[PDB]
């Protein structure tokens, strides 16, 4: 019986943020820098852990499921844009595994 959004900020996001593979997901995909003109046409709903952090810090979310959905969007965005077996995909898969472990200890 502890608050879920608190859990998401202090435990789930903290764990994922400190991970070795977090850096490409700590801010939006800069499509100009990387020269990716199709990224924002293909990806209708950009997401990254930076925005999720901002949202948790700034009372954006209606509930914990809306935040979980954003985490899931970030991962699937990455699997949609990139070929399977790309290194960015392997990094996301690792983050997703950890995400789902930490979620399965979520209070209620
Ligand atoms: C470009 C790149 C080279 C690497 F060796 C490793 C990574 C992770 C890598 O990806 C990124 C590096 C930096 C950044 C910054 C900091 C600018 O936001 C972003 C990525 C990156 C993050 N995410 C979530 C992505 O989905 C993709 C995708 C790509 C990418 C760049 N070029 C491609 C395709 C186009 C031909 C290869 N994909 O780069 C990123």
Range of the domain at 102: 2-106
**CB-ligand 1 contact for 87 (6 Å cutoff):** yes
Residue 95: CB atoms within 10 A of its CB come to 23
CA distances to 10, 30, 45, 74 from 102, in Å:
11, 28, 24, 17
**CB-ligand 1 contact for 76 (6 Å cutoff):** no
Question: Tokens in use for 21?
Answer: 């593979």
Please name the residue whose Cα sits nearest to atom 6 of ligand 1: 88
Resolution in Å equals: 2.7
CB contact at 8 A, 49 and 22:
yes
Domain CATH code at residue 22:
1.20.920.10
Please name the residue whose Cα sits nearest to atom 12 of ligand 1: 24
Which residue carries 């899931």 as its tokens? 72
Q: Buried b / exposed e across 14-41, counting CB within 10 Å, b at 16+?
A: eebeebebbeebeeebeeeeeeeeebee
Name the domain count of the chain: 1
Kindly give the number of the ligand 1 atom that is closest to the alpha carbon of 34: 31
Question: Tokens in use for 47?
Answer: 């997401």
CB contact at 8 A, 76 and 99:
no
> Residue 46: which of 19, 70, 14, 82 has the closest Cα?
70
Q: Which residues contact 43 (CB under 8 A, 6 or more apart)?
A: 29, 77, 80, 81
């Amino acid at each position: 019986q502890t608050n879920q959004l608190q859990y998401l900020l202090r435990v789930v996001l903290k764990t994922l943020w400190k991970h070795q593979f977090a850096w490409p997901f700590q801010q939006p995909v800069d499509a100009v820098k990387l020269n990716l003109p199709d990224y924002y046409k293909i990806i209708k709903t950009p997401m990254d852990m930076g925005t999720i952090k901002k949202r948790l810090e700034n009372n954006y979310y209606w509930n914990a499921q809306e935040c979980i959905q954003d985490f899931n969007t970030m991962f699937t965005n990455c699997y949609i844009y990139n070929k399977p077996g790309d290194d960015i995909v392997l990094m996301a898969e690792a983050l997703e595994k950890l995400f789902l472990q930490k979620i399965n200890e979520l209070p209620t």
